[PDB]
Every structure is written in structure tokens, then in C-alpha cells.
Write a protein that binds this ligand. Structure first.
Ligand SMILES: O=c1ccn([C@@H]2O[C@H](COP(=O)(O)OP(=O)(O)O)[C@@H](O)[C@H]2O)c(=O)[nH]1
Lengths: 353, 352
């Protein structure tokens, strides 16, 4: 049952550098999810990539732009020195060393190339139906290779006309790196860019009105914003906890009574919610996007109406009705590498040969 | 030792539409050159294409663009329903029915796909250097597959930094389709895609100054671009349409000479040799591909670029050139049987 996989990373940026999007966090966990079952995983990724403990080969070139120029009719683009093209030309040279190649990129090229490979190629789609050129490439790959496409959510699968023929593998997190904290301080947390248009003001005003300091984790780009926040809400409002590593983020976040999540719909990913549950921290989130699949209403968090102070404050007031051990228990059951590995095997192993 | 070849056309539009330029004449002629030596040739092209005599397979979808966009920094582009992507998908599915695939398109994708094929893929490049993305794709294919890249002229080769590593196969025509005409009307000809920055203006001015009507053939693009020619110059310049080879050669044969007045590069090969095959000397700016086709003062005039007095002087000396000589040079240099030898010398060694 042990096999050899090659993972081909996203062209959007390096692993380990803060700017491959969500694929940057998922690729290493999925690799671990298989290496922990005895499989070999090697990784191909852009120059500058860092990844502990796995064979890693890096490839030079220009990062794929997130662009989206003319909406749904945007064509696929290949610039000179495309890192995406060179990743796939390199994967093709070495294809006979692997039983299967797993693509993490959301792009036309790898889907198109799939029949030109003798080794089977599977695709983990991380968005979002976004363009005709992409929707048609995935549909065609599905017709020739049933079972070759997976998604992380049903919501994302439903944005595609062929969504029922994609497999859902869910989300995973390296739970070993997250300590359960059953005894928090009377503080709330918020995770994200300390910048305008992130819903930070909504979190601050609801924490303060609820009577609890807000700790924040993330990147400060404009110090004048920090000052504006102080002038709006005073200097006991928000406490800067750092940009800060995974291990640092988890002991910090774990001491919170709850995590507030107030992002715009286009930034409403579920990743940080999982990290919160893993520390035993319940989540109060706007009831749209990624959190709707992570949080169990009245049990592991509260899903509230967007942009309404009273809904945040009513939720914060009811954090004590949620059991922190149940949050952790849900993370162990739903989002572990163990759970993920089994879902990967179910998906991939029928594709071998 | 007969062989099976698959020719893949340009994705810029159907064969017969005029949208693909000289490639629409080159690909059927080269197919004919090989089939005359006993080989089998099949063609794959966009939906709407026509090809007398040969197996053709067509594929629907959206046409590739001219690719002039931006300048050298234009990325390669693959739209939804890309005819280019579907052509190469179809070539791949049938690669085992052929000994070699010959690509005629000036595009990243076929170059990129070459190592993904088991059947060998050669490339006949019809343009000079235009982009970073294409320059690099060609170089990389040359690096891995020496001898797999061909051009039509040494001048076109010299626009690339790796030009000395390309094989030049020149130009040829189906000579039996072109009638020699020894008795021209007092008119001048111009043949090409009708469009800005193609030199049409210079040609019109020079003909009018020399007091000879200009007859113009070619695929158009917006009739506004036409109008203003009759009220900056006047005349009927006389537009003859976009026509078949048989129509073009009978029209062009009536001309005293052909004007080629490109602003840039190019304008490499096909129309100058067609004019010669009819017996019509060529007056061209001395830049680009014309230098290698025309024999100065015998089959044409090669004059200082961008000088109207030069063209008018040349128009003035058309009489002294021998029309039979132009035709004899077409026969000696631009024949299909010779192209047939050159193509085999290029392609046969790329097999197994
Ligand atoms: O009425 C016409 C005018 C032109 N042509 C053909 O158009 C091509 C020349 O195209 P162009 O000058 O656009 O050459 P390009 O620069 O596109 O290769 C030649 O092969 C001609 O045989 C034609 O068939 N009928």
C-alpha cells in the first residue's frame, strides 16, 4: 500500500514565505498526512521555497499573477519565464519516478497537460469557480478522468456546474503543533492584517462594549492606522501581539475566551477558525463563507449576521455556554492529519495504474 | 521509405480566409512538395478551412489573435474554447498515425508541448523575432532539439539571437498555377494585408507621382481604413479584392511592376516570388527578405528605404527589366520539386 507521490506546488509564490495563499499552508500538511502512513512525498516548488524534511526541488521563474483582468472571460496567460510552465516541464521529465502527481495549482496548464502524462495526475482545486477557461479545463479533465478532481468544501464545489462529480477532502491541520488551553484569560482575539477594510473596527467596538480587551495577531503596514484606532477607541482597546510564528500564535490565541472573525466576504477563509478550535477556543464569525463549514452553531462558536454590532455583542455574551473541550474534540475528529490522510487515500488510490 | 506527416496550421483563422497571411499559401505548397515525392500529408486546421486534394481535419473554437499586443512583453494567451489548444490536443491523440508533426503556427504552446510528444515535432517559423515569450520558447526547443527549427530567410533568422542555429529552407510556389504575361498594362500592383503601417501610403503616393494607377489586392480590416485614400490621393488606387491564387496571378500579371514598401520587417517572401512567377519585376525597399529574392537591376529594383524619389525613379526604369528573366528566375529558384528536396533534407533526419 505504500506509494510515491510528487506534489507540484502553486506558482503564485514560494512555500514558507507568507505568499502562496492557502496552498502554502495546505501542501505541507497534506504531505505529512501521507508521509505518516508510510508514503513518500517529494515536492516541486518555486525558487525561494522552504519546506522541512521532504525532498524539495525548486524551479526559477516568474510567479503567476492572481490578475483576474476581464472577469470570467480572462484568458490563461503564460509570461516569459513562467514558473508554472517550468514546474510542469520538470514534473514531466521525472514522471516515471512516481506513482501519481498531485497538482495544487488553480490554472489551465496542468489540467490541459494531464493526457500528455503517462503517470496519473490528480488535481486539488482550492477555489472558487472564477473563469470560463478554468471551468472548461476542469470539466474536460473530469470527463476523461472521472474521480481526478477534489475540493476542500462543498460550498466551493457547488459554484461549479460539475460540482457533484468532485470529491470533498475537507481541511486539515497539524494538531500536534496546537496545545489545548482549557483555562483562558478574559480577552478576545482577532487574527489578520492590521489594516483598514478588515473588519477590525467592528471587532474592537464589540469587544470594548462587551468589556473585554482585544488581542490582535498580524501585520502592520501603516502606523497611522494604529493611531487612528487609538483615537477612535482609546489605548486600552486593542493589544498588538505580533506577526508571529505558528507555535507563537497557538499559545497566544489559546489564552483567549473567543476568536472574533470579521472579514469581508472575499477574505472569508476558514483556516484560522480551525486553528482556534484546535486550541480549545470557540469562534464568533460572520455567517458567510468558510466559517459556515467549520463552526457548529451554539456548540463550537456562534455564526452572526455581518456588520451588526449587537449580533457580535450578543454572541460574546454567550461564550460561556460553549465547552472548550468540545471545540478541541471537533478539531481532533474533523481536521486532523489522520482524518485527512484517510480521505486522501480514498480519493487517490483508485487513480493508481 | 515513404513517410506520414501531419501539418498543423495557424490558429489565427481558417485556411482560405486570408487571416493567416502567407502561411495559407506555404502550408498547401509544402504539403504538395512532399506528396509529389511519395509521402503522405494530412493537415489539421481551424473550422471553416478549405484545402483542395489533401486529408484535412478541422477543429472548432476561438481564433488566436495577430499577437501584436503590447510589444515584446505580451504573454502567451489561451482563451476559452482556444482553437490552438484543441488543435494540439487532437494532434496528441493521433500522434502515432504519423512519423513527424510539422507546426506552422507562431505560438508558445506547440513549442512548449514538443517534449510531451513521442512523435517528433518540427517547427517552421514564419515570422521574425516579436516577443520575449516566443524568443525563449524557440531557443529552449532549439537547445533540446537541434535542427528542429526552420525559417524562410537568413534575414528573418538574423532578427533572433540564435538565428545561426536555424535552418533556412527558403521559399517556393506551385509554378504551374502562375501564368507568364509578357504584355502588361501601364499599371502597378501592390499585394498584402490591408492595414495601417504596411506601407500602402508610400506605394499609393509613388504610383500617383509616377502617373500610373495602382491596383491593390489583399484581405482588408475595416473599410474606414480604405476611405480617405480617394480624398488624400484620389483615383477610382483601385481595390481588386481578396482572391484565389488563380485570380491573383491573372490580375497581377497585367501589372508593369509590384511595389513593396514595408515600414518595418516584414514582408519576407511569398508575394515577391508570385510577382516574379507572373513575369513582373519587383520594386522594393532594400530592407528585409526582398534583398535575398530580387536581383538588383535584373528582376527588380532594391532602393533606399522611405524615399519616394527612389521609388519613382525605379517605376521609371521598369521597362528596361526583362519580364522573361523574372519568370526564368522564379523557375530556377522557387520551384516545388526543389523545396521538396530541401524539406526532406531538413525533416528526414528528425525521424527516429
Ligand atoms: O488577393 C490576394 C492577396 C494576397 N493573397 C495571399 O496573401 C499572402 C500574403 O500575405 P501577407 O502579405 O499578409 O504576408 P504575411 O506578411 O502575412 O506573411 C500571399 O501568400 C498571397 O498569396 C491572396 O491569396 N489573395
Amino acid at each position: 500500500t505504500a506509494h510515491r507521490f510528487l506534489f507540484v506546488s502553486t506558482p503564485v509564490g514560494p512555500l514558507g514565505s507568507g505568499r502562496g495563499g492557502g496552498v502554502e499552508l495546505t501542501l505541507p500538511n497534506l504531505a505529512k498526512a501521507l508521509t505518516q502512513r508510510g508514503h513518500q512525498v517529494s515536492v516541486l516548488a518555486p525558487a525561494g521555497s522552504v519546506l522541512p524534511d521532504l525532498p524539495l526541488e525548486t524551479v526559477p521563474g516568474t510567479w503567476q499573477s492572481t490578475a483576474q483582468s476581464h472577469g470570467r472571460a480572462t484568458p490563461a496567460e503564460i509570461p516569459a519565464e513562467s514558473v508554472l510552465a517550468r514546474l510542469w516541464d520538470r514534473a514531466h521529465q521525472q514522471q516515471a519516478d512516481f506513482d501519481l502527481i498531485l497538482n495544487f495549482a488553480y490554472d489551465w496548464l496542468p489540467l490541459y497537460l494531464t493526457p500528455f502524462f503517462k503517470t496519473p495526475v490528480a488535481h486539488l482545486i482550492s477555489m472558487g469557480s472564477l473563469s470560463e477557461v478554468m471551468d472548461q479545463a476542469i470539466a474536460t479533465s473530469l470527463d476523461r478522468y472521472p474521480g481526478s478532481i477534489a475540493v476542500h468544501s462543498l460550498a466551493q464545489a457547488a459554484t461549479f456546474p460539475f460540482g457533484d462529480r468532485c470529491l470533498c477532502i475537507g481541511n486539515a491541520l497539524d494538531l500536534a503543533a496546537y496545545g489545548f488551553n482549557p483555562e483562558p484569560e478574559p480577552v478576545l482575539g482577532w487574527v489578520g492584517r492590521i489594516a483598514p477594510e478588515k473588519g477590525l473596527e467592528d471587532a474592537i467596538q464589540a469587544a470594548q462594549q462587551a468589556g473585554l480587551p482585544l488581542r490582535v495577531w498580524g501585520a502592520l503596514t501603516e502606523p497611522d492606522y494604529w493611531q487612528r484606532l487609538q483615537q477612535q477607541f482609546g489605548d486600552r482597546a486593542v493589544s498588538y501581539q505580533g506577526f508571529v510564528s505558528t507555535d507563537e500564535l497557538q499559545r497566544g490565541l489559546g489564552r483567549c475566551q473567543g476568536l472574533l472573525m470579521t472579514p469581508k466576504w472575499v477574505e472569508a477563509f476558514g483556516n484560522v477558525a480551525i486553528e482556534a478550535l484546535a486550541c480549545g477556543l470557540p469562534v464568533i464569525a460572520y455567517a458567510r463563507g468558510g466559517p459556515l463549514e467549520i463552526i457548529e452553531q451554539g456548540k463550537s462558536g456562534w455564526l452572526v449576521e455581518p456588520d451588526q454590532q449587537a449580533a457580535l455583542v450578543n454572541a460574546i455574551g454567550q461564550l460561556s455556554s460553549l465547552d472548550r473541550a468540545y471545540c478541541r474534540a471537533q478539531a481532533e475528529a474533523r481536521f486532523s492529519l489522520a482524518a485527512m490522510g484517510q480521505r486522501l487515500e480514498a480519493w487517490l488510490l483508485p487513480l493508481l495504474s
